[PDB]
Design a protein around this ligand. Structure first.
Ligand code: HEM
Length: 154
């Protein structure tokens, strides 16, 4: 699948708002993932001791990780589909070291959409949400193809 330039622009125009405060958006997204799908937290040896939303909010280390995650995703989105070089290292680490199934990438995609929908109704109406969903679907499809090449069922 291939996004139109107009779809990419809807993606990039909400991402511009995320970038006013990537750390706060990152916290909201990972906390939403862990609350909606608690089994995902068990993939993180670094964070799985955290018991409550309050502890997650107070973790400086989690905040930092969420900045790394959203900046990596932002760099992918800014390539507007030309993201082979960015996906190689990410797919390798997430297949072989972290062992993240495609279903869990679906769950984080849901969390991203939920937070953007809550925080950004001015830039995240129906057409914009559709564009973001298409971008995240493209990302997951390309990662799933890389996962297979790398030897991981996903
Ligand atoms: C939008 C999707 C995602 C992006 C962009 C992303 C990005 C990253 C980045 C940039 C790193 C650090 C470098 C590396 O190891 O590759 C990382 C680490 C990691 N990711 Fe992801 N990630 C995503 C989804 C997920 C999901 C859904 C899980 C678990 C359910 C996960 C689990 C991990 C783990 C366990 C680490 C290592 C954390 C640590 O011990 O330092 N990732 N991720």
């Amino acid at each position: 699948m291939v996004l139109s330039e107009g779809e990419w622009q809807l993606v990039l125009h909400v991402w511009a708002k995320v970038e006013a405060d990537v750390a706060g958006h990152g916290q909201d997204i990972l906390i939403r993932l862990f609350k909606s799908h608690p089994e995902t937290l068990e993939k993180f040896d670094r964070f799985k001791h955290l018991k409550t939303e309050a502890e997650m909010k107070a973790s400086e280390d989690l905040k930092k990780h969420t900045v790394t995650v959203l900046t990596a995703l932002g760099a992918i989105l800014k390539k507007k589909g030309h993201h082979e070089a960015e996906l190689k290292p990410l797919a390798q680490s997430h297949a072989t070291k972290h062992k993240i199934p495609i279903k869990y990438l679906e769950f984080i995609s849901e969390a991203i959409i939920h937070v953007l929908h809550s925080r950004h109704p001015g830039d995240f109406g129906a057409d914009a949400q559709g564009a973001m969903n298409k971008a995240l679907e493209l990302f997951r499809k390309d990662i799933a193809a890389k996962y297979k090449e790398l030897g991981y069922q996903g």
